[PDB]
Design an enzyme around this catalytic site. Structure first.
Site, PDB file in Angstrom:
ATOM      1  N   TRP B 102       9.194  -3.366  -0.647  1.00 35.59           N
ATOM      2  CA  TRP B 102       9.477  -2.650  -1.885  1.00 35.59           C
ATOM      3  C   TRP B 102      10.263  -1.368  -1.608  1.00 35.59           C
ATOM      4  O   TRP B 102      11.120  -1.020  -2.396  1.00 35.59           O
ATOM      5  CB  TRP B 102       8.192  -2.376  -2.681  1.00 35.59           C
ATOM      6  CG  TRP B 102       7.647  -3.670  -3.260  1.00 35.59           C
ATOM      7  CD1 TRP B 102       6.429  -4.251  -2.988  1.00 35.59           C
ATOM      8  CD2 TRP B 102       8.323  -4.574  -4.163  1.00 35.59           C
ATOM      9  NE1 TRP B 102       6.315  -5.430  -3.674  1.00 35.59           N
ATOM     10  CE2 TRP B 102       7.460  -5.644  -4.401  1.00 35.59           C
ATOM     11  CE3 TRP B 102       9.561  -4.559  -4.813  1.00 35.59           C
ATOM     12  CZ2 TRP B 102       7.799  -6.692  -5.247  1.00 35.59           C
ATOM     13  CZ3 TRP B 102       9.892  -5.603  -5.652  1.00 35.59           C
ATOM     14  CH2 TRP B 102       9.014  -6.651  -5.853  1.00 35.59           C
ATOM     15  N   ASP B 172       7.266   5.313  -5.873  1.00 31.05           N
ATOM     16  CA  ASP B 172       6.913   4.019  -6.468  1.00 31.05           C
ATOM     17  C   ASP B 172       5.413   3.771  -6.215  1.00 31.05           C
ATOM     18  O   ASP B 172       5.017   3.460  -5.081  1.00 31.05           O
ATOM     19  CB  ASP B 172       7.737   2.923  -5.801  1.00 31.05           C
ATOM     20  CG  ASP B 172       7.412   1.532  -6.303  1.00 31.05           C
ATOM     21  OD1 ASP B 172       6.490   1.376  -7.149  1.00 31.05           O
ATOM     22  OD2 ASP B 172       8.076   0.586  -5.811  1.00 31.05           O
ATOM     23  N   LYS B 196       0.014  -4.142 -12.233  1.00 29.80           N
ATOM     24  CA  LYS B 196      -0.909  -4.241 -11.092  1.00 29.80           C
ATOM     25  C   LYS B 196      -2.223  -3.535 -11.425  1.00 29.80           C
ATOM     26  O   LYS B 196      -3.286  -4.145 -11.383  1.00 29.80           O
ATOM     27  CB  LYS B 196      -0.256  -3.781  -9.767  1.00 29.80           C
ATOM     28  CG  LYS B 196       1.276  -3.758  -9.715  1.00 29.80           C
ATOM     29  CD  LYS B 196       1.962  -4.837  -8.884  1.00 29.80           C
ATOM     30  CE  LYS B 196       3.521  -4.725  -8.965  1.00 29.80           C
ATOM     31  NZ  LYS B 196       4.236  -5.578  -7.944  1.00 29.80           N
TER      32      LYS B 196
HETATM   33  C1  LIG Z   1       5.585  -5.550  -7.931  1.00 36.79           C
HETATM   34  C2  LIG Z   1       6.119  -4.252  -7.359  1.00 36.79           C
HETATM   35  C3  LIG Z   1       7.402  -3.868  -7.740  1.00 36.79           C
HETATM   36  C4  LIG Z   1       8.227  -4.682  -8.697  1.00 36.79           C
HETATM   37  O1  LIG Z   1       7.821  -4.550 -10.064  1.00 36.79           O
HETATM   38  P1  LIG Z   1       8.557  -5.375 -11.237  1.00 36.79           P
HETATM   39  O2  LIG Z   1       7.852  -4.841 -12.401  1.00 36.79           O
HETATM   40  O3  LIG Z   1       8.298  -6.816 -10.933  1.00 36.79           O
HETATM   41  O4  LIG Z   1      10.017  -4.991 -11.167  1.00 36.79           O
HETATM   42  C5  LIG Z   1       7.931  -2.689  -7.263  1.00 36.79           C
HETATM   43  N1  LIG Z   1       7.244  -1.901  -6.370  1.00 36.79           N
HETATM   44  C6  LIG Z   1       5.965  -2.290  -5.968  1.00 36.79           C
HETATM   45  C7  LIG Z   1       5.263  -1.390  -4.987  1.00 36.79           C
HETATM   46  C8  LIG Z   1       5.408  -3.473  -6.434  1.00 36.79           C
HETATM   47  O5  LIG Z   1       4.263  -3.780  -6.039  1.00 36.79           O
HETATM   48 CL   LIG Z   2       5.800  -3.851   0.595  1.00 35.45          CL
END
Ligand SMILES: *Cc1c(COP(=O)(O)O)cnc(C)c1O
Ligand SMILES: [Cl-]
Ligand SMILES: *Cc1c(COP(=O)(O)O)cnc(C)c1O
Ligand SMILES: [Cl-]
Lengths: 358, 360
Positions: B102, B172, B196
């Site tokens: 990510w 993020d 999540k």
């Molecule tokens: C799943 C995830 C993403 C991607 O998110 P989307 O909503 O599918 O674009 C980005 N960063 C992390 C850490 C993730 O776990």
């Molecule tokens: Cl990762």
């Protein structure tokens, strides 16, 4: 006692919501909610694919078009389209038929050369311009139209034959309200929340060979190619919104499809337009008769005091959503597919009683 | 019928009370005789929900008043480009700390838009750890320093955060936001896809210092300017109203159980069940993460060979476990144990792991 004339988000079919409520905790015998599924699961993949297949059947979408489910609303498409197609040396050509058309043009201007093929702005967007008026350029990247001008209450009765460049249509407020000849278009897009379900997903129907190629320098999420290649599963989709779209599409199919829905829409629009037309000028429609929308009916009373009295009475009587957009004033009755004819009849009755009591 | 143990990595398990609440009022929200999905986003009924979700986040994470909360579409993935579009300028550098896949995706999007730099990376170590903060290579003209708090694919997580004062710190936090208390004032901006730990998919939460992300952006498309959404309170265009409603419901559930400290205690207990099972397994299960970088949200591990991995995952699926297949980059298994994944599912996973080892 509640009549939902909301302009977006809007009324949903009762069977689609009842179905969603019934299985909210246990979708397809999984004993979890559809909202808890992985988008990589067979259970979700089945819904995602069914929604596509229902759209394909209902609109008769040819095999060489892809159906994408994207986030960002129609508004993100205003920029994503020119990012992908408006290349140096080409022109983003727009037909202006209302406020939503203007918003689309504005985003293309940030990104490249634009042009106005035709416009009814000078006449307050009371009509769709004759196609014979369209100014087309050899180097057009596309020609963009707005099929239903949600704020002004006008609508294309049919669509121009355009083959020098792809015809692109923002069909947010009238998609799947009637049959379409999809082959007339390079691309159709629509936020789902007016006529297809709840907000949070945007449907994009695109000729594959137009947009299936990587565009240099465009961010990954903003390339149509990304979503085409990944079948709208590049990143996490709006799974519940797509599920609800599937439910709405099932309802349209069950009622007899696009032709059946068009017949319902014509019948309920007639109820309101006849009331306007028989009112001896007490209610005046904004649209020229020959450009009238079947999806959003715009009208005014003779002055603003009367407009306010009418809308206040409507609110008291349980009508929701009827305030017109400021550029048009007055009243906007949004009568999308799922708005029932009995609500339209109730609106007529309200209009007649209000005039009688004025 | 199979029992359900929902270890999905995103979208993911939701709290039962939030789902029950949604189901009960799905046809008639707030006595309006309309679903929340059928309301105008400019109605008082919807505006109340929108505002309540912000206020719950603000209370639960203790977000300072000089931060704004946005609800956007597009996922965390759209943030990967939106951030550099708004902050990465000519003459500045988007500086990234790479701690997994990510992180790489975020860097990749910034590279398309400007100059970038890698402040630190554990890529050479297969992303088994978070780098020491002393390793960070920083630049006076950094536009920002970007981190990934929880590396969802690799199963590692920042145990604490670096003290950064030379440039804005951006994170993020998709896979660990509101899993524990957070000192928001350490960050210029935090973003997270909701799916999540906060709700269902379709909305992305952005917590941003007001003074930070809305300048010198004339060339940026309207929808891709943070300024647009700040000024309109995330109602510039039609928001994902049901997703934000569900987020509100999840936040109420977190509040009701005792907030960020109470959920952190639950999460630590859940993770311990699984990590103790791995550590006590005499190598039958091997965690990907170094112990000192272990994620409390995504537990990644492998059995001794791919045949055993496959057999284990097949047995898990038969017994009602959902979502345990690892991402291909680690192979093996990933047990996602976000806030709403119950401790008793972790108990069940332990029992499956013990039985599988004993029967192997
Ligand atoms: C799943 C995830 C993403 C991607 O998110 P989307 O909503 O599918 O674009 C980005 N960063 C992390 C850490 C993730 O776990
Ligand atoms: Cl990762
Ligand atoms: C409502 C509407 C839009 C904007 O849709 P969002 O999903 O809110 O971005 C665009 N075009 C038309 C014709 C609309 O009616
Ligand atoms: Cl319009």
């Amino acid at each position: 006692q509640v009549f939902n004339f909301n302009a977006g988000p809007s009324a949903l079919p009762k069977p689609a919501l009842e179905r969603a409520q019934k299985e909210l905790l246990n979708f397809n015998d999984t004993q979890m909610s559809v909202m808890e599924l992985s988008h990589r699961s067979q259970s979700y993949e089945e819904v995602h694919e069914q929604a596509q297949n229902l759209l394909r059947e209902l609109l008769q979408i040819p095999n060489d078009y892809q159906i994408l489910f994207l986030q960002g609303g129609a508004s993100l498409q205003f920029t994503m389209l020119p990012m992908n197609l408006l290349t140096k040396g080409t022109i983003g050509n727009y037909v202006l038929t209302g406020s939503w058309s203007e918003k689309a043009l504005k985003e293309a201007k940030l990104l490249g050369e634009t042009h106005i093929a035709a416009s009814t702005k000078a006449n307050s967007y009371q009509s769709i311009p004759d196609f014979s008026e369209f100014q087309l350029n050899e180097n057009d990247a596309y020609l963009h139209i707005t099929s239903n001008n949600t704020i002004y209450g006008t609508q294309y009765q049919n669509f121009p034959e355009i083959n020098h460049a792809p015809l692109i249509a923002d069909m947010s407020s009238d998609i799947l309200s009637r049959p379409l000849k999809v082959n007339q278009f390079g691309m159709i897009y629509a936020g789902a929340q007016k006529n297809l379900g709840p907000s949070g997903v945007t449907v994009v129907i695109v000729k594959k060979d137009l947009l299936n190629t990587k565009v240099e320098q465009v961010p990954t999420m903003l390339q149509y190619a990304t979503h085409i290649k990944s079948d709208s599963l590049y990143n996490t989709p709006p799974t519940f919104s797509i599920y609800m779209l599937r439910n709405v599409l099932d309802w349209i199919k069950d009622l007899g499809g696009a032709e059946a829905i068009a017949k319902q829409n014509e019948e309920k629009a007639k109820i309101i337009y006849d009331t306007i037309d028989e009112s001896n000028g007490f209610y005046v429609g904004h649209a020229e008769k020959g450009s009238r929308s079947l999806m959003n009916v715009t009208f005014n009373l003779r002055n603003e005091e009367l407009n306010q009295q009418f809308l206040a009475k409507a609110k008291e009587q349980g009508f929701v959503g009827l305030n017109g957009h400021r550029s048009v004033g007055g009243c906007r009755a949004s009568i999308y597919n799922a708005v029932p004819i009995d609500a339209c009849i109730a609106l007529r009755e309200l209009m007649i009683q209000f005039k009688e009591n004025a």
